Design an enzyme around this catalytic site. Structure first.
Site, PDB file in Angstrom:
ATOM      1  N   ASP A 185       2.389 -11.893  -9.812  1.00  0.00           N
ATOM      2  CA  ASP A 185       1.790 -10.454  -9.795  1.00  0.00           C
ATOM      3  C   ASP A 185       1.066  -9.789 -10.773  1.00  0.00           C
ATOM      4  O   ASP A 185       1.496  -9.834 -11.895  1.00  0.00           O
ATOM      5  CB  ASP A 185       3.283  -9.502  -9.690  1.00  0.00           C
ATOM      6  CG  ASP A 185       2.943  -8.134  -9.191  1.00  0.00           C
ATOM      7  OD1 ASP A 185       1.826  -7.581  -9.098  1.00  0.00           O
ATOM      8  OD2 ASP A 185       3.819  -7.917  -8.582  1.00  0.00           O
ATOM      9  N   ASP A 236      -3.510  -4.526  -8.101  1.00  0.00           N
ATOM     10  CA  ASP A 236      -1.985  -5.164  -7.985  1.00  0.00           C
ATOM     11  C   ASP A 236      -1.959  -6.042  -6.769  1.00  0.00           C
ATOM     12  O   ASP A 236      -2.233  -5.835  -5.725  1.00  0.00           O
ATOM     13  CB  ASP A 236      -1.067  -3.904  -7.916  1.00  0.00           C
ATOM     14  CG  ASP A 236       0.219  -4.227  -7.536  1.00  0.00           C
ATOM     15  OD1 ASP A 236       0.804  -5.310  -8.156  1.00  0.00           O
ATOM     16  OD2 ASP A 236       0.734  -3.351  -6.821  1.00  0.00           O
TER      17      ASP A 236
END
Lengths: 328, 6
Positions: free
Chosen positions: A214, A34
């Site tokens: 993201d 992430d």
């Protein structure tokens, strides 16, 4: 060039898993690489939390490279919060290993319903040092210093819904990932890989809106006000609470999301945030645009966008590497 | 889905 691509194993195209490893016995771990966060954590054998009974829990006492700390910490994501305590050990990502200060979760109850129902064991950040809780020097940043990889930068290439795999190459830019051109945008700040774009699709233009690329978000993102007027049209249906609107896929008024910085313009078509919802009558599909409110007018450009353009992240270049992912 | 830190 020589690097190491970490194959991310897609799931309904709204989250992808990698294969991390910690300690000497190389305890395996299904991570989520992430970029919305910059911290690595894994559930501890001490995690007496239910959503932990169904996964690989890290075992310090089984590693000889396990250094002790114990300082307690928390980490708030959108899907919830986790808590545990600091520890240090030799983390592995493919052909590379490095001593990294990570976290051992003991409390994950807050991360339900997400955690208890997913397959990732823990999270491995990839954002910037000033976003991490602890001021932990980022993994990839580290492997650069230790002269372990060509360049201080990683690469994100994801498949769509299924089709093929996806990769996280650390170090250099593997050119077989995009077709032609590659543009770079500065950064506003060094937290989430963020840029100064003018987000809009319909007649909703906004100047320099914060856009965070993201890998850990599975939906695009605009705030509440910027979306309340989204029903100004778009006969979008609102299935009961969670996860977002569902609409008819052969619609004809859904606006290609337009993202454009002065240097260059990035466009996203409806095809990206649609389907399946087939078995459940194949004439319907999920919208995939959630209303998330961060600080200010922050837009979360997650997978959908990364599902169109193969991305490049670099601390050195100090920007993001945008360019059309190549479905090949 | 997931919307990974605030």
């Amino acid at each position: 060039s020589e690097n190491d691509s970490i194959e991310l194993d897609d799931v309904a195209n709204l989250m992808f898993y990698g294969e991390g490893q910690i300690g000497t016995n190389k305890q395996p771990f299904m991570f989520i690489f992430d970029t919305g966060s910059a911290n690595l954590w894994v559930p501890s054998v001490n995690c007496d939390s239910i959503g932990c009974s169904t996964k690989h829990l890290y075992d310090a006492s089984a590693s000889k490279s396990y250094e002790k700390d114990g300082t307690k910490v928390e980490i708030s994501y959108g899907s919830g919060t986790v808590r545990g305590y600091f520890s240090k050990d030799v983390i592995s990502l493919g052909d590379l290993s490095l001593p990294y200060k990570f976290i051992e979760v003991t409390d994950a109850d807050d991360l339900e319903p997400i955690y208890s129902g997913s397959e990732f064991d823990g999270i491995l950040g990839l954002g910037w040092k000033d976003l991490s809780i602890g001021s932990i020097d980022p993994v990839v940043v580290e492997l650069k210093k230790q002269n372990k990889i060509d360049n201080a930068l990683f690469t994100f290439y994801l498949p769509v819904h299924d089709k093929h795999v996806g990769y996280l190459t650390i170090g250099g830019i593997e050119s077989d990932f995009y077709e032609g051109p590659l543009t770079y945008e500065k950064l506003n700040h060094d937290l989430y890989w963020q840029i100064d774009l003018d987000i809009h699709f319909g007649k909703y233009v906004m100047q320099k809106a914060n856009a965070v690329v993201d890998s850990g978000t599975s939906t695009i993102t605009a705030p509440t006000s910027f979306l309340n007027k989204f029903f100004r049209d778009m006969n979008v249906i609102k299935v009961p609470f969670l996860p977002l609107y569902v609409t008819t896929c052969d619609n004809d008024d859904l606006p290609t999301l337009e993202f454009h910085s002065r240097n260059n313009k990035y466009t996203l078509e409806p095809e990206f945030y649609m389907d399946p919802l087939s078995d459940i009558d194949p004439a319907l599909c999920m919208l995939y645009i959630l209303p998330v409110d961060i600080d200010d007018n922050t837009f979360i450009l997650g997978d959908p966008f990364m599902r169109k353009y193969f991305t490049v992240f670099d601390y050195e270049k100090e920007s993001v590497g945008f360019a059309v992912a190549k479905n090949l | 889905x997931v919307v990974x830190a605030x």
